[PDB]
Amino acid sequence: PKALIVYGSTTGNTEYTAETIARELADAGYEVDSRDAASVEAGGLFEGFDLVLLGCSTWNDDSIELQDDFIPLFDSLEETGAQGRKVACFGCGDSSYEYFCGAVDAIEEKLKNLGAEIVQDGLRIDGDPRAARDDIVGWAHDVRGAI
Ligand SMILES: Cc1cc2nc3c(=O)[nH]c(=O)nc-3n(C[C@H](O)[C@H](O)[C@H](O)COP(=O)(O)O)c2cc1C
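That is the input. Now the predicted structure with flavin mononucleotide docked in place:
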């Protein structure tokens, strides 16, 4: 199976998360394509992928709390080929904030509205993902199993 991992990361937490997930998948036998949201084009992004994992950090704001690099993707999610696609979301945040990993909720909700198949509840990481290594690995483990 082929998996696409797209992440929006500002300080590198979600990026570390994405790489950890990517390794787990790889070791399981998937061909994984991991990409920074800043370098992708939305049109047909998901074509040909068996699994798509989208991740992004959350930023407190009155309009849009998504990580800046992920915004363009999010705004054109309807052109990615999400209908009937098996997907799962992840993101880093901080429980000291009102909307803890609110970006995860937003992405899941929009994917659900576009007809994607959410395979598992999103991975919401509080603080340093290097300290949540087990959680990431375990979650990656569960999404493979839901596929
Ligand atoms: C100014 C600021 C605002 C933040 N706002 C939120 C927030 O609304 N919700 C959340 O869960 N985390 C929030 N966080 C924490 C970031 O989402 C958290 O640091 C995350 O690890 C960053 O991930 P990244 O390196 O992949 O971008 C904020 C952090 C900063 C510095």
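The longest helix spans residues 13-27.
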